[PDB]
Amino acid sequence: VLSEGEWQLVLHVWAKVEADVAGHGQDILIRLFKSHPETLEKFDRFKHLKTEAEMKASEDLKKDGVTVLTALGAILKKKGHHEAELKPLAQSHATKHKIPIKYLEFISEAIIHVLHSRHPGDFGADAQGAMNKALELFRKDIAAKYKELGYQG
Ligand code: HEM
């Protein structure tokens, strides 16, 4: 459970993300693939791309970054009350995409990196800690749902 003030810090920086969801999503996915190249293997559509410029030119990558951030933003706006939003996400990510929790850690690291790089004045230590807690809660709850579906990832 985050405090109300922590949730407000999370949602304050998230509004900045919403000014350019697609550019933030591109930077986050590219950071994820640069830091953890194995994750790129999960995206059949563009797993063959080799340079940063190719990744920035990929319409599929840009669309997927929007998909991820749109879903995550809706989750964050629930302020922890996100069982109904997590249910379909756990279903697909446990049974079809097979995304282990460690990969959700990797993408959390990429999110924090991009938010700090782009919005340092709105992402100091207390806001970073709030976002860390919110992403940890997301990962904890989706791991529990993973197990309910038989996936130990
Ligand atoms: C904040 C974490 C994430 C969120 C909110 C998120 C959300 C979504 C959503 C809403 C979709 C489309 C609907 C669905 O299939 O459920 C999707 C698809 C997908 N996600 Fe995730 N995702 C996250 C993390 C990841 C990570 C870390 C990976 C891989 C390392 C991944 C791999 C995929 C793949 C492969 C698809 C299907 C792409 C396609 O076939 O078009 N996701 N994600």
XYZ file of N, CA and C and ligand atoms in Angstrom:
502
model
N 0.884 -1.153 0.000
C 0.000 0.000 0.000
C 0.924 1.205 0.000
N 0.821 2.048 -1.025
C 1.541 3.313 -1.051
C 0.703 4.369 -0.338
N 1.363 5.417 0.150
C 0.589 6.523 0.705
C -0.069 7.307 -0.427
N -1.123 8.058 -0.084
C -1.741 8.951 -1.065
C -0.709 9.878 -1.703
N 0.195 10.439 -0.897
C 1.198 11.335 -1.457
C 2.121 10.624 -2.431
N 2.506 9.390 -2.103
C 3.307 8.614 -3.048
C 2.553 8.363 -4.354
N 1.282 7.941 -4.268
C 0.497 7.771 -5.492
C 0.449 9.059 -6.302
N 0.334 10.207 -5.629
C 0.290 11.465 -6.364
C 1.606 11.758 -7.063
N 2.732 11.376 -6.464
C 4.008 11.554 -7.155
C 4.082 10.660 -8.392
N 3.594 9.427 -8.251
C 3.550 8.502 -9.382
C 2.725 9.096 -10.516
N 1.529 9.584 -10.186
C 0.630 10.063 -11.226
C 1.065 11.412 -11.779
N 1.796 12.198 -10.985
C 2.325 13.459 -11.480
C 3.354 13.217 -12.571
N 4.302 12.299 -12.337
C 5.254 12.040 -13.421
C 4.572 11.299 -14.577
N 3.547 10.486 -14.280
C 2.896 9.766 -15.368
C 2.197 10.716 -16.334
N 1.639 11.819 -15.825
C 1.052 12.815 -16.727
C 2.073 13.331 -17.743
N 3.331 13.468 -17.313
C 4.381 13.867 -18.238
C 4.588 12.803 -19.306
N 4.527 11.526 -18.913
C 4.588 10.450 -19.912
C 3.458 10.595 -20.934
N 2.267 10.931 -20.451
C 1.106 10.972 -21.324
C 1.179 12.095 -22.347
N 2.029 13.096 -22.115
C 2.254 14.112 -23.152
C 2.810 13.520 -24.454
N 3.583 12.421 -24.380
C 4.137 11.775 -25.591
C 4.360 10.299 -25.263
N 3.242 9.603 -25.115
C 3.267 8.176 -24.833
C 4.169 7.421 -25.804
N 4.063 7.692 -27.107
C 4.803 6.875 -28.073
C 6.309 7.071 -27.948
N 6.762 8.310 -27.792
C 8.189 8.535 -27.631
C 8.738 7.946 -26.350
N 7.977 8.059 -25.256
C 8.399 7.394 -24.027
C 8.446 5.879 -24.214
N 7.446 5.306 -24.902
C 7.409 3.855 -25.075
C 8.548 3.357 -25.938
N 8.899 4.129 -26.967
C 10.066 3.790 -27.771
C 11.320 3.790 -26.919
N 11.533 4.861 -26.148
C 12.756 4.924 -25.359
C 12.808 3.793 -24.344
N 11.664 3.447 -23.746
C 11.652 2.404 -22.726
C 11.959 1.046 -23.343
N 11.311 0.714 -24.460
C 11.595 -0.581 -25.072
C 13.023 -0.656 -25.590
N 13.525 0.421 -26.184
C 14.896 0.387 -26.676
C 15.870 0.222 -25.525
N 15.604 0.884 -24.401
C 16.463 0.718 -23.236
C 16.425 -0.716 -22.722
N 15.232 -1.312 -22.691
C 15.068 -2.700 -22.280
C 15.868 -3.634 -23.170
N 15.782 -3.431 -24.482
C 16.464 -4.330 -25.408
C 17.969 -4.119 -25.386
N 18.419 -2.890 -25.131
C 19.851 -2.633 -25.029
C 20.418 -3.245 -23.756
N 19.698 -3.102 -22.641
C 20.206 -3.585 -21.364
C 20.052 -5.095 -21.243
N 19.009 -5.658 -21.845
C 18.686 -7.076 -21.688
C 18.268 -7.633 -23.037
N 19.237 -7.904 -23.911
C 18.894 -8.275 -25.291
C 18.021 -9.508 -25.412
N 18.064 -10.422 -24.434
C 17.231 -11.616 -24.516
C 15.752 -11.257 -24.600
N 15.358 -10.126 -23.999
C 13.946 -9.746 -24.027
C 13.470 -9.466 -25.449
N 14.366 -8.992 -26.326
C 13.948 -8.702 -27.691
C 13.442 -9.959 -28.388
N 13.912 -11.137 -27.954
C 13.498 -12.378 -28.597
C 12.006 -12.633 -28.464
N 11.348 -11.991 -27.492
C 9.921 -12.203 -27.297
C 9.057 -11.527 -28.351
N 9.612 -10.621 -29.157
C 8.842 -9.829 -30.109
C 9.193 -10.316 -31.513
N 8.465 -11.337 -31.985
C 8.755 -11.945 -33.282
C 8.763 -10.908 -34.368
N 7.942 -9.879 -34.187
C 7.727 -8.867 -35.216
C 8.978 -8.063 -35.559
N 9.822 -7.819 -34.563
C 11.003 -6.980 -34.760
C 12.240 -7.515 -34.031
N 12.256 -8.796 -33.662
C 13.403 -9.333 -32.941
C 14.679 -9.343 -33.770
N 14.578 -9.150 -35.082
C 15.718 -9.141 -35.984
C 16.400 -7.782 -36.088
N 15.808 -6.728 -35.529
C 16.363 -5.389 -35.684
C 17.677 -5.259 -34.929
N 18.599 -4.490 -35.503
C 19.988 -4.537 -35.081
C 20.550 -3.212 -34.600
N 19.996 -2.084 -35.026
C 20.524 -0.790 -34.624
C 19.448 0.027 -33.925
N 19.901 1.019 -33.148
C 18.969 1.945 -32.511
C 18.090 2.638 -33.545
N 18.675 3.053 -34.673
C 17.888 3.752 -35.687
C 16.812 2.854 -36.287
N 17.134 1.579 -36.521
C 16.107 0.641 -36.963
C 15.002 0.520 -35.927
N 15.369 0.495 -34.649
C 14.347 0.363 -33.617
C 13.463 1.598 -33.566
N 14.053 2.783 -33.753
C 13.255 4.001 -33.768
C 12.371 4.076 -35.006
N 12.782 3.449 -36.110
C 11.968 3.491 -37.319
C 10.858 2.444 -37.341
N 10.864 1.494 -36.410
C 9.921 0.387 -36.442
C 8.546 0.846 -35.981
N 7.560 0.753 -36.874
C 6.183 1.047 -36.496
C 5.672 0.044 -35.474
N 6.061 -1.226 -35.611
C 5.602 -2.243 -34.677
C 6.138 -1.990 -33.280
N 7.411 -1.604 -33.168
C 7.963 -1.319 -31.849
C 7.267 -0.117 -31.223
N 7.030 0.933 -32.015
C 6.349 2.117 -31.498
C 4.941 1.771 -31.018
N 4.228 0.937 -31.783
C 2.898 0.508 -31.367
C 2.962 -0.295 -30.075
N 3.940 -1.197 -29.954
C 4.010 -2.027 -28.753
C 4.354 -1.189 -27.523
N 5.208 -0.180 -27.686
C 5.492 0.706 -26.567
C 4.255 1.454 -26.100
N 3.418 1.887 -27.048
C 2.155 2.520 -26.661
C 1.247 1.534 -25.938
N 1.153 0.312 -26.445
C 0.345 -0.715 -25.783
C 0.776 -0.920 -24.329
N 2.081 -1.072 -24.109
C 2.581 -1.308 -22.756
C 2.264 -0.127 -21.855
N 2.580 1.090 -22.313
C 2.400 2.242 -21.436
C 0.934 2.580 -21.213
N 0.072 2.344 -22.200
C -1.355 2.579 -22.007
C -1.896 1.654 -20.921
N -1.522 0.369 -20.989
C -1.986 -0.571 -19.971
C -1.402 -0.233 -18.602
N -0.107 0.108 -18.564
C 0.519 0.389 -17.278
C -0.058 1.654 -16.668
N -0.336 2.666 -17.493
C -0.925 3.888 -16.966
C -2.283 3.645 -16.343
N -3.123 2.843 -17.015
C -4.423 2.511 -16.425
C -4.252 1.794 -15.086
N -3.275 0.885 -15.019
C -3.006 0.191 -13.761
C -2.595 1.176 -12.673
N -1.647 2.064 -12.982
C -1.165 3.000 -11.972
C -2.280 3.908 -11.486
N -3.198 4.276 -12.376
C -4.279 5.153 -11.966
C -5.234 4.461 -11.021
N -5.243 3.123 -11.011
C -6.031 2.442 -9.988
C -5.443 2.516 -8.576
N -4.216 3.007 -8.395
C -3.627 3.184 -7.059
C -3.681 1.895 -6.238
N -3.287 0.797 -6.880
C -3.262 -0.506 -6.247
C -4.538 -1.305 -6.398
N -5.647 -0.667 -6.767
C -6.937 -1.352 -6.911
C -7.078 -1.903 -8.329
N -6.092 -2.699 -8.723
C -6.000 -3.136 -10.100
C -6.047 -4.625 -10.294
N -6.941 -5.309 -9.586
C -7.143 -6.732 -9.878
C -7.764 -6.962 -11.257
N -8.757 -6.147 -11.631
C -9.456 -6.367 -12.896
C -8.586 -6.016 -14.092
N -7.688 -5.043 -13.937
C -6.757 -4.728 -15.015
C -5.656 -5.772 -15.126
N -5.237 -6.360 -14.001
C -4.167 -7.344 -14.050
C -4.640 -8.674 -14.602
N -5.922 -8.998 -14.424
C -6.416 -10.316 -14.833
C -6.139 -10.655 -16.299
N -6.537 -9.841 -17.288
C -6.229 -10.204 -18.684
C -4.745 -10.140 -18.999
N -4.014 -9.251 -18.325
C -2.587 -9.130 -18.586
C -1.844 -10.366 -18.094
N -2.173 -10.830 -16.885
C -1.583 -12.064 -16.389
C -1.948 -13.231 -17.288
N -3.212 -13.301 -17.723
C -3.623 -14.396 -18.599
C -2.711 -14.502 -19.823
N -2.566 -13.397 -20.559
C -1.772 -13.482 -21.782
C -0.286 -13.640 -21.485
N 0.216 -12.986 -20.438
C 1.658 -12.976 -20.236
C 2.138 -14.260 -19.597
N 1.260 -14.955 -18.885
C 1.625 -16.244 -18.317
C 1.454 -17.352 -19.343
N 0.358 -17.324 -20.107
C 0.030 -18.499 -20.908
C 0.437 -18.396 -22.365
N 0.536 -17.191 -22.922
C 0.900 -17.028 -24.320
C 2.302 -16.462 -24.488
N 2.566 -15.256 -23.970
C 3.867 -14.639 -24.204
C 4.955 -15.251 -23.323
N 4.579 -15.754 -22.145
C 5.478 -16.368 -21.161
C 6.608 -15.411 -20.788
N 6.194 -14.339 -20.128
C 7.101 -13.277 -19.704
C 7.430 -13.509 -18.232
N 8.642 -13.925 -17.887
C 8.950 -14.165 -16.471
C 8.965 -12.863 -15.685
N 8.777 -12.988 -14.369
C 8.819 -11.803 -13.515
C 10.136 -11.058 -13.678
N 11.247 -11.778 -13.854
C 12.517 -11.075 -14.019
C 12.498 -10.145 -15.233
N 11.754 -10.496 -16.287
C 11.647 -9.568 -17.415
C 10.796 -8.353 -17.057
N 9.787 -8.528 -16.198
C 9.049 -7.376 -15.695
C 9.926 -6.489 -14.820
N 10.873 -7.081 -14.083
C 11.888 -6.293 -13.387
C 12.729 -5.505 -14.371
N 13.180 -6.163 -15.444
C 13.972 -5.469 -16.458
C 13.202 -4.278 -17.035
N 11.923 -4.475 -17.371
C 11.204 -3.344 -17.973
C 10.937 -2.263 -16.939
N 10.744 -2.638 -15.668
C 10.633 -1.636 -14.611
C 11.891 -0.778 -14.517
N 13.062 -1.422 -14.595
C 14.328 -0.695 -14.593
C 14.394 0.275 -15.763
N 13.931 -0.158 -16.937
C 13.947 0.716 -18.114
C 12.997 1.898 -17.951
N 11.813 1.655 -17.374
C 10.862 2.733 -17.118
C 11.485 3.779 -16.207
N 12.078 3.323 -15.100
C 12.674 4.256 -14.150
C 13.813 5.028 -14.806
N 14.625 4.343 -15.615
C 15.715 5.022 -16.299
C 15.201 6.128 -17.212
N 14.173 5.831 -18.008
C 13.680 6.812 -18.973
C 12.991 7.973 -18.266
N 12.220 7.691 -17.218
C 11.565 8.770 -16.494
C 12.593 9.680 -15.840
N 13.659 9.098 -15.280
C 14.682 9.930 -14.674
C 15.442 10.728 -15.728
N 15.706 10.123 -16.888
C 16.447 10.827 -17.935
C 15.652 11.999 -18.481
N 14.347 11.818 -18.640
C 13.526 12.827 -19.285
C 12.944 13.839 -18.320
N 12.677 13.454 -17.075
C 11.935 14.314 -16.160
C 12.613 14.381 -14.799
N 13.920 14.677 -14.739
C 14.591 14.605 -13.431
C 14.001 15.551 -12.396
N 13.486 16.711 -12.818
C 12.882 17.637 -11.875
C 11.570 17.164 -11.283
N 10.932 16.175 -11.905
C 9.703 15.569 -11.409
C 9.940 14.130 -10.999
N 11.197 13.752 -10.827
C 11.504 12.360 -10.551
C 12.723 12.278 -9.635
N 12.685 13.040 -8.547
C 13.694 12.952 -7.513
C 13.498 11.711 -6.656
N 14.229 11.675 -5.541
C 14.336 10.442 -4.763
C 12.983 9.969 -4.251
N 12.161 10.885 -3.747
C 10.863 10.454 -3.223
C 9.931 9.972 -4.338
N 9.939 10.648 -5.494
C 9.132 10.190 -6.624
C 9.660 8.874 -7.185
N 10.984 8.715 -7.242
C 11.560 7.452 -7.691
C 11.174 6.319 -6.755
N 11.215 6.570 -5.444
C 10.835 5.542 -4.495
C 9.372 5.171 -4.622
N 8.511 6.173 -4.823
C 7.094 5.908 -5.050
C 6.897 5.050 -6.291
N 7.532 5.419 -7.402
C 7.396 4.610 -8.611
C 7.943 3.200 -8.407
N 9.099 3.070 -7.755
C 9.620 1.741 -7.426
C 8.590 0.909 -6.683
N 7.960 1.496 -5.666
C 6.967 0.764 -4.886
C 5.764 0.386 -5.746
N 5.330 1.293 -6.622
C 4.157 1.004 -7.453
C 4.451 -0.118 -8.435
N 5.637 -0.102 -9.028
C 6.014 -1.178 -9.935
C 6.271 -2.486 -9.193
N 6.794 -2.423 -7.963
C 6.941 -3.639 -7.164
C 5.587 -4.243 -6.833
N 4.599 -3.404 -6.506
C 3.259 -3.907 -6.221
C 2.650 -4.569 -7.454
N 2.794 -3.922 -8.612
C 2.363 -4.521 -9.868
C 3.004 -5.894 -10.069
N 4.322 -5.993 -9.859
C 5.003 -7.261 -10.107
C 4.588 -8.322 -9.097
N 4.415 -7.933 -7.834
C 3.977 -8.882 -6.808
C 2.602 -9.452 -7.154
N 1.675 -8.568 -7.517
C 0.311 -9.017 -7.776
C 0.242 -9.840 -9.054
N 1.014 -9.464 -10.074
C 0.908 -10.246 -11.295
C 1.605 -11.604 -11.107
N 2.656 -11.683 -10.272
C 3.268 -12.980 -9.968
C 2.284 -13.916 -9.281
N 1.493 -13.389 -8.344
C 0.478 -14.230 -7.706
C -0.524 -14.752 -8.734
N -0.943 -13.891 -9.665
C -1.868 -14.352 -10.703
C -1.208 -15.357 -11.645
N 0.070 -15.144 -11.983
C 0.827 -16.122 -12.759
C 0.716 -17.495 -12.136
N 0.964 -17.574 -10.830
C 0.936 -18.880 -10.180
C -0.458 -19.475 -10.216
N -1.490 -18.641 -10.024
C -2.858 -19.153 -10.121
C -3.114 -19.821 -11.460
N -2.459 -19.345 -12.513
C -2.595 -19.902 -13.847
C -1.612 -21.025 -14.122
N -0.807 -21.412 -13.134
C 0.122 -22.510 -13.298
C 1.491 -22.119 -13.805
N 1.783 -20.829 -13.912
C 3.055 -20.366 -14.448
C 3.949 -19.888 -13.311
N 5.129 -20.500 -13.194
C 6.061 -20.201 -12.116
C 7.155 -19.239 -12.556
N 6.936 -18.502 -13.638
C 7.941 -17.579 -14.138
C 8.144 -16.376 -13.241
C 4.748 -2.964 -17.618
C 4.816 -4.209 -18.119
C 3.947 -4.658 -19.303
C 2.696 -4.297 -19.643
C 1.728 -3.348 -18.909
C 2.365 -4.987 -20.868
C 1.163 -4.892 -21.534
C 0.840 -5.545 -22.694
C -0.429 -5.489 -23.396
C -1.647 -4.659 -22.947
C -0.334 -6.275 -24.479
C -1.423 -6.546 -25.541
C -2.521 -7.444 -24.961
C -1.979 -8.755 -24.428
O -1.398 -9.555 -25.211
O -2.133 -8.991 -23.211
C 0.993 -6.862 -24.493
C 1.498 -7.714 -25.445
C 2.754 -8.287 -25.459
N 3.728 -8.173 -24.476
Fe 3.483 -7.168 -22.717
N 3.444 -5.772 -21.235
C 4.439 -5.579 -20.306
C 5.683 -6.175 -20.309
C 6.182 -7.031 -21.276
C 7.547 -7.497 -21.359
C 8.642 -7.101 -20.349
C 7.636 -8.291 -22.443
C 8.831 -9.064 -23.051
C 10.062 -9.073 -22.530
C 6.337 -8.342 -23.062
C 6.017 -9.048 -24.192
C 4.834 -8.901 -24.878
C 4.527 -9.489 -26.157
C 5.481 -10.387 -26.977
C 3.295 -9.127 -26.508
C 2.561 -9.517 -27.802
C 3.100 -8.674 -28.956
C 2.400 -9.104 -30.217
O 2.401 -10.327 -30.520
O 1.838 -8.218 -30.898
N 5.464 -7.567 -22.329
N 1.678 -6.399 -23.389
